[PDB]
């Protein structure tokens, strides 16, 4: 019964220094072993259900096999937080320049996004004009009022302040500028 | 299926339902019995009083702590706390739900066997798990890497964690804790000349310690200033309406943490051990740990403690390298909060040790699972 | 239709597509497995790590090279290198294309038999060829009469070729390589007294070696000057921000190549072997090879080494004859670049050995193609 | 040139010349003022009477001590005691000599600040030193490693010393003393029903305590025997010619020191504290302190007290280790005797703080010199 | 005329006259200064205490070693050690005699520069020689071909010698030593739950290690047996008369030398290094070095170590070849004993480097003679 | 008066008295000097070592042969060989007797010039004779028409003689020898993959060659059988107890002598040369030499060599004529044996050139006597 969009400002600190990053990538920031956008939409769909098929890198198939019961969102959030090698299929983002990583000498890059936001019982995605991002349930963010568009899928989990957002979808230079270390 | 989370802490014990983000009860982990006979007929007095009961009757009463540093010393009185916890505060039966229990990083094996044996045989619980307190704290900050610093009501200890691997050899323990700061605080008030003796009087001091006291940014200049200027001075009023005044003493307490030599303790001030634990790491990781550093537990709550820490490691200057401190609010609760997250996770359905499996294995399997 | 060009190197491994002029991937040929349990639930740890991952996680890890000199000792780790190479680095499926593999000029037949069997059976390639590194290096300058010197992470070897003919009797081998310089450099840094032990420290040593070090134009006069003058000394900063200073060691390392007696190796300094291998030529050819001489591989990369080679062989003076060195830039890549060009040629379409033919012949025919 | 040594005690005050081996004056530390009019004209009655004079007029009088437990409450009247002491008791003028003064081991700064200020400003002495009773007691036997016990009319305290180093943290103080035994004996005699009230009768109690009373080796066997047999009873005759008999009361008083709970005090019996102070010592020295242990002061005067001390510490059994007690005769005088011996020593010419330095520094230097 | 033989050891220091066959004094290399103010007048306290005095006063004190593996960090305290050694232990004046000094086989030049400079300037000696511990150890049994294993309080190192020629490249060093075993034993006793912290307790730990501990002949069977049977346990009594019992720890400690991975040290267990050092020799000598093998230094003292060493190196089985161990008695003294024998020999009259020559040459001549 | 008999060999040197039938000493013709500093005092090391001692010390040492093919390269060391021979090996003084000295059939005049000059000036001999090995070899069976084959460590050569007249033109020499077989054997050992490099291993190669290796009667059939069958293989164990296995190499070695093209040598196989030397004779003399032809020396020791020589020249078929070889035992000694027999004969009293005549004439008279 509503459409509203809210806009979020995000920082990345990375050894692909801006001038080189922009030189080598025409296509901005990406994961090591990225899914298709179609496959990533399937993956995000599995949290609703319809899990009868898998098409994606087998290591992640092992992870989702682990999460047999419904409320996949918690285990997904944990797994994406702690796993760190090349196998990962996402990019991870920090809101406050405090990133849990090199966080020094690394330049910092600034990205702006406008999004719809959802909290999930396990079967529906439900409007959050009030954002409810202080209670430490995960939150899920979509480009559009339904899963189909799948142009960005990103979720937000952590404390209210030390919050972190991660994306199953390319973050092109179109979104991104150089920013003040 | 909703697990239950229950905590053992040398000062305070916190009780939770899995999936909550705040504990439903907190009470002092204290066991008490009356110092005098009592005279009115039919008053129907209990044998003993525990937790909150002890504050109301405090004058008539004698107090024990069942916890010392990282050791339990009095299993029957310790048992009485758990008994009180489920029935009165939560009003839930133990077999219904699994239970979660916490331990300091290095303690003699015998404690975990008793805790394990009692939980199955006395409370007939479906399942029980044991977890190591420094690790749970990291879950509440939720970063891949970070040195953990803990100081609680009874122990001080360090554990570095990198990318999910602990390094058993770098673990360091220091027996400097809130109890000693309180004993030290009794002697400086003795300078003014108030009498304070016996545990009941001892606890009244703790309130002043928790409210008024603060860290100096430099001990020598601040104390020289305080000798000249009244503005530091604070005055305070007891439950009996007698009134108390404090001077240089307000800063003198936190100074203990940086110079045990004031109290004749010898194992170095916490930064110096903290610096030593990083130095005992491999030459690569050292850079990465300056990058993230985590503090937990009631002793950290004091104002300004983080500021003094930074200057100390900066003064050690392991390098021309950036140094930072993560001192998030709600720091005291964070150790419980992490337990709530971990109880929700799917994978634990593997980790839960069943009553049936414990009966098959016997106790020895329960320690082997970890340190 | 584009065949594949693949390289085996004691330090670095290079993979190529026909028509590239720069290697598509290069990464350290290292395989690593974890030293510690790991503790955080759901972390999803791997069995093992390879290439850059091992550098990123270097502190927690223990490191192997699957190569010795030119021997291989651990076939499954080698396979894991190839597996990771094709799927992650190239993202091309192996059956698509025939495959090209490289070996040092004298190595025991069993290695090539293993590579043949594995390449056909595991990766279902259409055809396979094996090729001898000096020749591909020579293609970088294509001269139809050539003398070749190679020194890589694990071997130093000689082959003269005339009008497209190599001379088996002239083949000479010296097993002095970067590994020996690294051990020697650890002992000389021990002279100042810094600690360096275990593989993680070994890689930092290798970085210092590549950045700071250089060849002396005369060992005795330079070292006598260095004893007086500070100006030679250089200072450098570790990942830990600890800082390092170097003196005589900077020239003293390369001197090993000119005097194996410093390390107790006995086969003469590299110029003396080069001259002796020429001496095994016919009395006519000697002039023709003094005129042009070809060098390849990472050890040569150092600054000024050719100058000392020139002065030393001039002083050896096989005759009053002109002396020259062919030391082209970007020399390290040249072995791959040459492999790509020769891989392009039509005749290789004759040379590609099919799986069907391998089953008909058996393996021995694959050795038969050359020495 | 003979300095003067002067002692402040809630019961007895002692004045001395260096080289004496018995105190030149001892008198009850008592100040008295008349409760009644008085009737003979021109009798020229005083404001107050002191010591034996005050004992002589005891019936007409109401009585004050100017000190408690350590603490002075009336600086001008205390001064009146000192004034009377210098002029009347010793018949020597006070300005003549430097002065030596004693304090219990932990008391609020104000006592030394006032005593310093008053003694310099009023009596204009040339130089001064202040000394701490445990140390002076230790000089009585000069042994270089000692733990010391004193218990007087107003304080009981312990100090371990080893080889001339104090251990600031091990110092422990307990304010349980003979006055409390006097109250306890008053309440049980009220149980039997003799009247005892007002200070004069309290002085009678003190006399009766000193003559009649003795220590039990076990309270329970003592009480079981005394309950049957009169033979324990002893009889004594008052100044009023009233006559007194004692039963269980004879032993029951000293027994209190081993169980403060009889009076509802909580801080453990003094031996239990001494043992706690030993446990609060370093783990090496403890054997050597069991090796030598020193007892002093009027409470020790009781018969048999060493035996009970021995049995209590043996039953605590810190180990199967030798334990010993030094209970020399003339123990009461020993704190002064030691003060005189130490007063003779040459090195003290450093320790005497001059009036001139007091005017330059102000008082704080006098506290600062030590505890 | 009798030259002097002097030893530097991270635990014990030994001083000798040429022609003695037992060291005249040996004492722990420890320097200590007081932690507390001190209180008794005229006690005349020292600045510091050394050797046995420091052991006697151990409780009051905080303790340093001036040695690190093979490094000195505090030249003045080391000097104070020498000062005490010459004047007190030998009671001979230093100028009288030429001097003999010992160093671990690979240590930074600055140590020999300081020892030379200080010995000449402070002790005005006539002549000096510096000597390398493995060689002196070999003289203890005089075999003209030897391979030597030494492990002392701070370093473990290997030297093969053949017919009087050393091979500089085969020398291997490992920084695993008694200090690390002591830290490991402290952590495992904390596992049982006895308290041990601060250096004073550390020396008690070293004593316990020396008495109770022994090597296991098989780790797996021994630990499986100990898990079943109490009978292994042994009990021992502290200076405090508190009493201690030990179980699995008894074998578990020495096992560290064969598996550094227990403590996270990485350079392989000592047998594997010994085997590698022989393998790093030429192919002829290898038989002759399996033929004779020599052990020295306090770590070897353990019971049964030779049997396990023999079986482990036999299990590597470089061949069906004879293996032998030379474990002569008085093994600890042998490093000094060899120095005494070699000091007796005539040829040293060439080797003594005079003070006059050192002033003429400067320091470098004393280093140039060797490493 | 008993003359002395002396032999020159790139491997072995033989010294004799006329009328022995076995040489009193034979030892490897090797001179060695030390590669390393040496450290043990008084070891009394030599400058250099020669013969069997050098084999004993082989590992510590670097090795030279002072003779090549038929040339001396280091006259002073060669003299040291002779010096050691006369004094140590023979224990006879050289001046006593005339002396007999040997040269291969074609070597530049300077060698005889040096031997003559040195023998006269240094050894003060009375008279001297020089003798040529082919003739002495022929004397072993005294047959009046003969062609002779000898092959040693550095040269292989043939001489036909008829009825006591030499044919200056028919003498043929070939410098293909055991050293070249040693190089081939090293490359084939590299085929299997054992490491063998540096002189110490080289001597092991020579031993292995002498025991294991044998001649094939036809290379192609032998290799076809050996490719299928293990049964040919034999296994052998080094001084290091390392163990070696050999296959095709066992026959593959001797075959090299018949096809130099395998090693890149160009001068035809040796039988073809022997036949070529035969071809410049008349068909009768050719006939008489085909009927019987004589072979000597270590290369002949191989099993079956007569069969291969016979069949190869038979296939050459100079005619339908019988061909034979006389290869009697102790064949190696025969050149000396012949020298001794010829030394006995009366006629030699003419051949001895006196020292006086040499001094008058100079050397050329010594040349004039023969080639
Ligand atoms: N490089 C970054 O900003 C970052 C933020 C969160 C997690 N990992 C990396
Ligand atoms: Mg008193
Ligand atoms: Mg030693
Ligand atoms: Mg010969």
UniProtKB/TrEMBL annotation, chain A:
Domain of life: Bacteria
The protein's name: TccC3
Taxonomy of the source species: Bacteria, Pseudomonadati, Pseudomonadota, Gammaproteobacteria, Enterobacterales
Residues of the full protein shown: 780 to 960 of 960
């Amino acid at each position: 019964t509503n459409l509203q969009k809210k806009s979020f400002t995000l920082y990345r600190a990375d050894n692909r220094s801006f001038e080189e990053m922009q030189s080598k990538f025409p296509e901005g920031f990406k994961a090591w072993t990225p899914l298709d956008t179609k496959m990533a939409r399937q993956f995000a769909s599995i949290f609703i259900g319809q899990k009868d098929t898998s098409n994606l890198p087998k290591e992640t198939v092992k992870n989702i096999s682990t999460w047999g019961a419904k409320p996949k969102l918690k285990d997904l959030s944990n797994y994406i937080k702690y796993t760190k090698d090349k196998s990962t299929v996402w990019v991870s983002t920090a809101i406050n320049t405090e990133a849990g990583g090199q966080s020094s000498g690394a330049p910092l890059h600034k990205i702006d996004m406008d999004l719809y936001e959802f909290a999930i019982d396990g079967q529906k995605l439900n409007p959050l004009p009030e954002g409810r991002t202080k209670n430490m349930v995960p939150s899920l963010l979509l480009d559009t009022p339904q899963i189909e568009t799948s142009s960005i899928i990103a979720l937000n989990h952590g404390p209210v302040n030390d919050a972190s957002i991660s994306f199953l979808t390319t973050i092109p230079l179109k979104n991104v500028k150089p920013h003040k270390r | 299926t909703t697990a239950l989370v229950c905590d053992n802490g040398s000062g305070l014990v916190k009780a939770g339902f899995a999936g909550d983000d705040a504990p439903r009860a907190v009470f002092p982990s204290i066991v008490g019995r009356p110092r005098h006979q009592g005279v009115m007929v039919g008053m129907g007095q209990k044998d003993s009083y525990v937790g909150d009961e002890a504050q109301s009757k405090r004058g008539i009463l004698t107090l024990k702590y069942p916890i010392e540093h990282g050791i339990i010393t009095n299993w029957d009185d310790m048992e009485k706390i758990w008994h009180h916890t489920f029935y009165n505060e939560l009003r839930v039966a133990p077999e219904e739900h699994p239970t979660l229990l916490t331990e300091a990083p290095l303690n003699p094996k015998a404690n975990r066997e008793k805790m394990t044996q009692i939980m199955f045989e006395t409370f007939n619980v479906p399942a029980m798990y044991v977890a190591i307190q420094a690790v749970l704290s990291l879950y509440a900050s939720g970063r891949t890497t970070g040195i953990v610093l803990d100081s609680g009501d009874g122990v001080t200890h360090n554990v570095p964690i990198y990318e999910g691997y602990a390094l058993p050899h770098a673990i360091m323990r220091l027996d400097l804790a809130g109890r000693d700061l309180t004993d030290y605080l009794m002697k400086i008030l003795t300078e003014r000349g108030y009498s304070f003796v016996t545990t009941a009087e001892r606890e009244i001091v703790r309130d002043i310690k928790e409210k008024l006291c603060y860290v100096a940014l430099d001990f020598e200049n601040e104390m020289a200033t305080a000798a000249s200027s009244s503005s530091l001075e604070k005055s305070y009023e007891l439950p009996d309406g007698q009134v108390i005044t404090i001077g240089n003493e307000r800063f003198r307490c936190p100074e203990t943490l940086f110079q045990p030599s004031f109290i004749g303790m010898e194992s170095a001030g916490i930064h110096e051990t903290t610096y030593n634990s990083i130095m005992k790491c491999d030459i690569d990781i050292r850079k990465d740990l300056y990058a993230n550093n985590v503090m937990s537990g009631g002793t950290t709550m004091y104002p300004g403690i983080a500021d003094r820490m930074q200057k100390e490691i900066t003064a050690l200057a392991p390098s021309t390298m950036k140094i930072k401190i993560i001192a998030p609010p709600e720091r005291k609760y964070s150790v419980w909060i992490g337990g709530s997250i971990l109880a929700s996770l799917s994978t634990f359905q593997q980790m839960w040790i069943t009553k049936q499996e414990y009966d098959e294995a016997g106790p020895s399997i329960v320690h082997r699972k970890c340190f």
